[PDB]
């Protein structure tokens, strides 16, 4: 009810009864009792209503025992989640994801292996915690196999650093891990953490890092003025040429509309051969290629 809900959660765990061996094997037997009983209830066969109510009571007892096992094992998941904390994900979120891993773990347990719950649960705790850390910690999502590759590379790079006391070349790390050096460069480029936009610059407080960046998508008024003047000048030089030449060039690059047209496409509405239409087209390109009608367009690029 106060601040620091980590303390509130730890007290919300409370004085749960820790389970010595016969207690949790009896609880697991009751789990099986409830689960097989509700499985029998799930069948569509008609039995006595009293037997159905008894099986429902067993199912409720099994659910209660499942709950009790959860509150018994919230201690171990808290003790294990703290091992992987302070790495971009919050401590209580790690606790909750480990709780997901533990409720996945206990569901897949059988009493045939006479082992304690710790050595079987810790595998799923570590697996779910590292999967959640791979999936949700970074702002850009990295798949779990990429995460395990990159942090294996990080740990062997740290081993190299503590071994020879010097920064290794990427070629050495590539050849000692049997991947290509360009792959190593790519994966350590991928393995980066973004910096927040709202970082203060220094003594000044109003000046932030966010106002220093520009945007390439911003429209430049000079560019738009150049574009509309290019359109106007192109229309003017089209009007400068002959009417038929203007008409044939207006369709070859589809200047009038959004679609260009081929020489065979315009040979029906106007009715000339491919030879003549391409000849007059190339004549128009040559005439516009003359240096007289170039300075009006050469600076326009």
């Amino acid at each position: 009810a106060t601040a620091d809900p980590v303390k509130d959660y730890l007290k919300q765990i409370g004085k749960v009864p820790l389970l010595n061996a016969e207690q949790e094997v009896e609880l697991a037997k009751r789990i099986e009792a409830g689960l097989f009983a509700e499985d029998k209830l799930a069948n569509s066969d008609k039995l006595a209503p009293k037997l159905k109510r008894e099986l429902e009571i067993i199912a409720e007892d099994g659910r209660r025992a499942k709950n009790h096992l959860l509150e018994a094992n919230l201690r171990l998941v808290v003790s294990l989640a703290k091992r992987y904390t302070g790495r971009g994900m919050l401590f209580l979120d790690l606790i909750q994801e480990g709780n997901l891993g533990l409720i996945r773990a206990v569901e897949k347990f059988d009493y045939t292996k006479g082992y304690k719950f710790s050595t079987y649960a810790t595998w799923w705790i570590r697996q779910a915690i590292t999967r959640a850390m791979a999936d949700q910690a970074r702002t850009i999502r990295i798949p779990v196999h990429m995460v395990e590759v990159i942090n294996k590379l990080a740990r062997v790079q740290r081993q190299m650093l503590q071994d020879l006391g010097r920064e290794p070349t990427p070629e050495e790390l590539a050849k000692e891990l049997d991947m290509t050096p360009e792959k190593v460069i790519e994966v350590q480029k991928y393995g980066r953490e973004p910096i927040s936009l709202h970082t203060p610059l220094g003594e000044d407080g109003d000046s932030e890092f966010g106002d220093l960046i520009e945007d390439s998508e911003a429209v430049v008024p000079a560019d738009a003025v150049s574009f509309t003047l290019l359109q106007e000048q192109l229309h003017s030089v089209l009007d400068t040429l002959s009417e038929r030449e203007a008409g044939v060039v207006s369709m070859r690059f589809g200047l009038t509309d959004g679609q260009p047209k081929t020489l065979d496409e315009i040979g029906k509405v106007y009715g000339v051969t491919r030879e003549r239409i391409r000849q007059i087209e190339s004549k128009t390109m040559s005439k516009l290629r003359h240096p007289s009608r170039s300075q009006v367009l050469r600076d326009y690029l």
Partner: protein, 1259 residues
């Protein structure tokens, strides 16, 4: 744009705004850098990231715009739509809003009658809540449940009796068998002790089972709505034992289930009932609860929105993730907070998918609620979500607030295009309206105009070639630039911009160098000093902007400062010294050619160039026809036998050459000024010129004065060698005598006959006497010829204190924490200090620097608060129909046989308007509705009037705003104020301008704290904040008998008013000073203890006029103590905006809440409409409130949102569903519409222009 609404946004509104669900937390792909599908930054929901492209790579063409892609669903459109398109996140379990819950209780509101700690318990998943109870069903079957409980008790008692009988039989059996076996001598005692231990333990668990049954019974017996249960076991056993009777839940869903069935109209009804009858803090509780609940009744917005089910998302541009150099990425913290909320919502959905324990689900819902709270307010509760480990993440609100918020950094003040900045240099060759821009500055500012003119002048074929030449920078570009920038004003501006004259439109002019060349005549109005001060140049752009620059803003139209009407564009540093040397009298300087006639000024100039006549020498110089004689020379005209007039005729004058030159500077129509000019008389001359000549003539005359002042100050004979600074020769013997008597005192103190404190007091007294005496000797020493006196006695630059502590001794100088060293600095700066004397000087110096830094900070703060409180008052009527006014005194402190005018008439009565005609002998001396200048006030005080009735702004009543006539003539134009002039901002700036100029601090407290009232700027801000001053001076409520009651623990005063009035008692401390007579005569006028009176009770017991006079007089007596002159109408505007709120009482027939903040006009309208209905009106008392409280309590919530408390007023507007009319200036600056002041009024924008018929007939 007519109205801007606000309110609670229910989930329907969020879904209407939204375009999809942000189901997944990830933002962008890690290799292709493309936005994800149905996650954050989604192109399907928010829009495409390129222009007319879609996510799946198809549909790249522009022709088929406005269609939906089949593969990926991305609409093809512009990339800017991602600045305006939002989605939403669907939360599995509802969460509360941190703005309403966990805030000021005036906005939490106690809508549900719950303590805030109870809310913390219930909605943060630590204590249960009962949402609904079938009370009538529970009470319907009370005998049945009572019979069941009785049956349970009966069977409990029966099994207890059976167990007791069995235990007794077992105890008897074991005692008998261990007493018959005889295993040990006293084994029966041991087994009996064990049996009785079993007895007591089993009896304990029996009483304990009885106790839990009793406590659950009495807990269920008193269960009702709004009931909490901290213990989870107790709620669980109520659920198990008792079913389908009471409905309860857990978390914010409890608040939603309560609010969906919350009956609030009858709540307001019974709450009004408890308002009607009661006493104590219950009145305040019910008052706040009714002022909050009644908002939901009148307004149509449902109160569902306090607890929310959906969370809208910022569009992705406003929370960007921008690519940088080197592959690094930068994202806003909003994306991280949204990612946290989405992750926790997905995990909660996963837990709800399967069967999960209640503790885990409750913890997940709690962390979801806390993450949503951190999104809305990171750092409101508990430790903020840090992130990287250095700083807290900034939430939505964290950028709607403060200096980094949108209201204060990107809406009121914005960056601008077409602007430039460089250092400033002085140019005497400029006119009054000219400034010199560099070539590069003028090319970059006027670049598009240069390209337009280059294409017009066909130096380049098209626009691109013109830009290429401009970037290359050929000489033809500079030539066409010089052809363009003329007749095109620019706005120059200094960064502090303390008052209205910080922005002045000049005409640019091409100069070399890299500095802006600025007229010296105007640099003092900028506070500009050429020590690397950098001035920004802004370019008016359209026709309207440069027209307002030319007409309203020009530097040749801003002669008079609006603070006091005094001229400010005649500086003093160098030209005043030149004119002083030009016009002073020949004292101490050998006058050559003294007393010889000259035919004209040309002959005098020829003689002065020859060298036989000095510049200042009493000569008879004849003047040509048309020269107006002096004011004092007209009656003593040259004696004439026939009738003649010297008004236009020639004349001879006994004046020097220099005064003839000075009157050649001034225009020919001005009378011959025939005195020492100095500075003050120069200010009077410039004031008269501005009052009696057009603007262009005044600009020309000040330009001539500048040029000649510089010319003669070059040859004035000022310089500072160390021989010019002279120490008094008597200072040696004066200091010798004083140190001799100090030595005598020191050997007197060595015997212990006097204390250290008394010796210190008398020593600082006698050393202050010594420094005053050597200052007088220094004044008696220097001649008029040395340049330091010539530049300090002329009003040029410097004060007598500085010359006192350069030539004479430095005097007494303060220690740390404001005391005085007994040993003063006996060495002058010309002589040079010693080591430790210089150390004690540094003590004062660093404290002074820190003091002026904090002083300018607080002055800026006070200026901003005054601007907010005093804005949105604009001259909006030509004239009122009123005739009421203020009885301002005009003649005061008259001696025997003579009448004298008031000393501060220049700031109080001047530049006002008479309410009515004044008559003394049946004839009007001054007509109504005219300004009061020198001549009219002199005529009135000569005729023998004592007080005048000036039509000021405090008495101004009008339909809207204030009128021009009731305000008085504007002090910045010299004429009547035009309708539309924003007088409020001018008043606020004029009050806030000399805030840095006060430079006051309490020198010494006298060894006691609290005896001295606040001085300087803290006194001003304490006065305008309407706070009670630190030195409280109580005022008697009525005349009567007052005596003292000197109780040992705490002093006491008692006044008993006569005429049967009730006794009132004032508490006074055991402090040193009380000035009232015991058993003496007292009345309402005086104060029981000398000190600052608390103005609240002054208003309460004296009246509105008395408190207005007191406030104006106090702030003016603070301002007059330093030399800064502020006209009293500038204060009167803020005081009128200060007393506008009225506090009402006994409002049982006016059907509104009694005892809150009520506007005066609204209260009067309510009174009119309730006396029209026949009901008796409600009473009301005026409420003197501070500038901040009056600024927050305003009708337009945009202006209050732009001020300090920007979260409380936003929540207040959302709760009250108030929409603000856009009358005002902050709310029109933000939107970008034209402000309704000056040119932006309706009566000015609605003009239609057409040429006359003869005009078009001519051409």
């Amino acid at each position: 744009f007519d109205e801007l609404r606000i309110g609670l946004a229910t989930a329907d509104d969020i879904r209407q705004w939204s375009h999809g669900e942000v189901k997944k937390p990830e933002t962008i792909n890690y290799r292709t850098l493309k936005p994800e599908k149905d996650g954050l930054f989604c192109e399907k929901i928010f829009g495409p990231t390129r222009d007319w492209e879609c996510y799946c790579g198809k549909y790249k063409r522009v022709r088929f715009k406005g269609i939906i892609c089949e593969r990926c669903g991305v609409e093809v459109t512009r990339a800017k739509v991602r600045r305006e398109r939002m989605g939403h996140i669907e939360l599995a379990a509802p969460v509360t809003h941190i703005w309403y819950f966990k805030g000021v209780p005036s906005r939490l509101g106690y809508l549900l009658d719950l303590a805030p700690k109870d809310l913390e318990k219930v909605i943060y998943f630590a204590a249960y809540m009962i949402t609904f109870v079938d009370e009538e069903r529970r009470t319907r079957d009370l005998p049945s449940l009572e019979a069941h409980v009785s049956v349970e008790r009966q069977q409990i008692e029966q099994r207890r009796d059976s167990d007791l009988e069995a235990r007794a039989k077992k105890l008897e059996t074991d005692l008998a068998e261990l007493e018959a076996e005889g295993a040990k001598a006293d084994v029966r005692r041991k087994v009996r002790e064990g049996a009785e231990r079993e007895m007591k333990q089993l009896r304990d668990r029996a009483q304990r089972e009885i106790d839990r049954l009793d406590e659950v019974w009495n807990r269920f017996k008193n269960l009702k709505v709004q009931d909490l249960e901290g213990d989870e076991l107790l709620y669980r056993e109520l659920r198990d034992r008792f079913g389908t009777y009471f409905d309860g839940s857990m978390g914010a869903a409890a608040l939603q289930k309560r609010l969906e069935s919350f009956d609030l109209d009858e709540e307001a009804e019974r709450l009004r009932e408890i308002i009607r009858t009661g006493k104590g803090q219950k009145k305040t509780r019910a008052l706040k609860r009714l002022k909050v609940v009644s908002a939901f009744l009148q307004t149509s917005n449902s109160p569902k929105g306090m607890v929310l089910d959906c969370v809208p998302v910022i569009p992705p541009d406003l929370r960007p993730m921008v690519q940088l150099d080197g592959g690094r990425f930068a994202t806003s913290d909003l994306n991280d907070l949204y990612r946290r909320v989405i992750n926790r919502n997905n995990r909660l959905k996963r837990l709800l998918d399967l069967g999960a324990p209640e503790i885990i689900v409750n913890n997940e819902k709690r962390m979801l609620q806390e993450a949503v709270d951190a999104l809305f307010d990171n750092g409101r509760r508990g430790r903020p979500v840090t992130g990287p480990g250095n700083r807290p993440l900034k939430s939505l609100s964290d950028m709607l607030k403060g200096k980094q918020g949108r209201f204060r950094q990107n809406l009121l003040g914005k960056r601008v295009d077409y602007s430039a900045r460089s250092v400033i240099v002085v140019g005497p060759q400029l006119k009054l309206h000219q400034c010199g821009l560099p070539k590069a500055m003028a090319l970059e500012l006027f670049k598009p105009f240069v390209m337009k003119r280059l294409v017009d002048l066909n130096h380049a074929q098209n626009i691109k070639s013109a830009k290429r030449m401009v970037e290359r920078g050929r000489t033809v570009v500079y030539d066409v630039l010089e052809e363009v920038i003329a007749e095109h004003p620019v706005l120059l501006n200094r960064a502090p911009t303390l008052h209205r004259l910080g922005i002045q439109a000049f005409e640019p002019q091409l100069v070399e160098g890299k500095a802006i060349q600025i007229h010296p005549l105007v640099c003092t109005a900028f506070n500009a000093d050429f020590d690397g001060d950098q001035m920004a140049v802004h370019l008016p752009l359209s026709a309207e902007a440069q027209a307002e620059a030319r007409i309203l803003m020009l530097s040749s139209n801003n002669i008079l400062k609006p603070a006091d009407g005094r001229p400010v564009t005649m500086p003093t540093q160098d030209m005043v010294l030149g004119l002083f040397f030009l016009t002073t009298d020949s004292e101490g300087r050998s006058p050559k050619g003294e007393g010889r006639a000259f035919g004209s000024s040309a002959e005098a100039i020829m003689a002065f160039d020859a060298g036989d006549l000095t510049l200042q020498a009493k000569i008879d110089i004849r003047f040509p026809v048309g020269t107006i004689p002096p004011r004092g020379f007209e009656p003593p005209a040259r004696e004439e036998g026939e009738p003649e007039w010297q008004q236009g005729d020639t004349f001879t004058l006994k004046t020097t050459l220099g005064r003839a030159l000075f009157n050649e500077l001034l225009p020919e129509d001005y009378p011959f000024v025939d005195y020492e000019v100095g500075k003050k008389q120069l200010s009077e001359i410039v004031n008269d010129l501005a009052e009696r000549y057009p603007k262009v003539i005044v600009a020309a005359t000040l330009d001539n004065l500048k040029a000649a002042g510089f010319f003669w100050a070059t040859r004035s004979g000022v310089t500072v060698a160390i021989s010019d600074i002279v120490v008094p020769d008597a200072k040696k013997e004066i200091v010798k005598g004083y140190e001799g008597q100090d030595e005598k005192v020191q050997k007197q103190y060595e015997r212990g006959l006097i204390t250290k404190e008394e010796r210190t007091q008398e020593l600082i007294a006698i050393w202050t006497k010594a420094t005053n005496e050597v200052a007088e000797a220094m004044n008696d020493n220097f001649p008029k010829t040395n340049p330091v006196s010539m530049m300090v006695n002329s009003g040029a630059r410097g004060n007598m204190m500085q010359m006192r502590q350069i030539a004479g001794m430095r005097g007494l100088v303060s220690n740390a924490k404001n005391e005085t060293i007994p040993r003063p600095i006996k060495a002058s700066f010309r002589e040079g200090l010693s080591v430790l004397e210089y150390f004690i000087s540094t003590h004062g110096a660093r404290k002074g620097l820190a003091d002026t830094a904090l002083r300018t900070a607080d002055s800026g703060y006070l200026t901003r608060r005054l601007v907010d409180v005093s804005q949105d008052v604009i001259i909006r009527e030509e004239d009122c129909g009123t005739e009421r006014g203020l009885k301002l005194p005009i003649a005061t402190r008259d001696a025997d046989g003579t009448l004298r005018k008031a000393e501060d008439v220049e700031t109080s009565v001047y530049a006002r308007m008479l309410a009515e005609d004044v008559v003394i002998d049946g004839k009007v001396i001054a007509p109504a509705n005219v300004d009061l200048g020198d001549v009219l006030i002199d005529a009135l005080v000569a005729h023998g009037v004592e007080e005048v009735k000036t039509r000021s702004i405090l008495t101004c009543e009008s339909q809207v705003g204030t009128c021009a006539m009731c305000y008085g003539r504007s002090l910045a134009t010299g004429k009547l104020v035009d309708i539309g002039e924003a007088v409020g901002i001018i008043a606020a700036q004029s009050i806030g301008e000399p805030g840095t100029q006060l430079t006051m601090r309490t020198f010494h407290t006298g060894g006691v704290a609290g005896d001295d009232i606040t001085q300087g700027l803290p006194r001003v801000v304490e006065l305008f904040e309407a706070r009670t001053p630190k030195g409280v001076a109580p005022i008697s409520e009525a005349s009567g008998r007052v005596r003292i009651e000197e109780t040992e623990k705490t002093k006491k005063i008692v006044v008993t008013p006569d005429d049967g009035s009730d006794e009132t008692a004032f508490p006074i401390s055991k402090r040193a000073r009380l000035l009232v007579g015991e058993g003496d005569h007292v009345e309402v006028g005086q104060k029981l203890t000398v000190g600052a009176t608390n103005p609240h009770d002054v208003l309460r017991i004296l009246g509105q006029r008395a408190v207005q006079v007191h406030l104006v007089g106090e702030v003016q007596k603070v301002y007059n103590s330093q030399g800064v002159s502020i006209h009293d109408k500038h204060i009167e505007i803020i005081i009128r905006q200060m007393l506008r709120r009225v506090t009402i009482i006994e409002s049982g027939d006016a059907e509104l809440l009694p005892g809150e903040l009520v506007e005066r006009t609204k209260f009067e309208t309510e009174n009119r409409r309730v006396v029209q209905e026949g009901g008796h009106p409600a009473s009301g008392r005026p409420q003197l409130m501070g500038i901040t409280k009056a600024s927050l309590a305003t009708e337009s919530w945009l202006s209050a949102a732009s001020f300090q408390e920007t979260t409380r007023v936003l929540t207040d507007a959302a709760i009250n569903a108030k929409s603000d009319s856009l009358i005002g200036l902050k709310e029109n600056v933000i939107i970008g519409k034209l402000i309704p002041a000056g040119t932006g009024l309706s009566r000015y924008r609605n003009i239609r222009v057409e040429p006359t018929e003869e005009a078009k007939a001519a051409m």
